[PDB]
């Protein structure tokens, strides 16, 4: 098998969770299944003191809010800037091949 480069990465919901996890429960507990298990697990860890809500939790919230604001504000510009550099490399390589043939 020749490894072919895909164009888009794997589908992802809620920012980071794989969609392959969410679609894994569709045939048994439907779409609402993974969200129900995630909500129940979050409730269980908070209630049974497994997740210690200490001072670092507020820092974890502050990072999450800052990260969401920073990515949503500058993500399009950076991704376009990176895709611009990729296109210039692709143009440079295809022009080399055409110039060598000519």
């Amino acid at each position: 098998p020749r490894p072919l480069r895909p164009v888009n990465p794997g589908k992802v919901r809620v920012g980071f969770v794989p969609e392959e996890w969410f679609t894994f429960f569709y045939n048994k507990t439907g779409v609402t299944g993974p969200y129900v298990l995630g909500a129940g697990a979050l409730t269980f860890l908070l209630s049974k003191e497994i997740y210690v809500v200490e001072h670092e939790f507020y820092t974890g919230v502050a990072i999450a809010i800052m990260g969401t604001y920073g990515v949503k504000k500058f993500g399009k510009q950076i991704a376009d800037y990176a895709d611009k550099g990729i296109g210039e490399i692709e143009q440079s390589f295809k022009e080399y091949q055409d110039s060598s043939k000519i």
Binding site: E54, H55, E56, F57, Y58, T59
Partner: peptide, 17 residues
């Protein structure tokens, strides 16, 4: 500084959080 700011807050109080 971050641990100081976190430890002097409460989850229940929306204003303090």
């Amino acid at each position: 500084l971050l641990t100081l700011l976190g430890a002097q807050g409460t989850l229940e109080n929306l204003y303090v959080t």
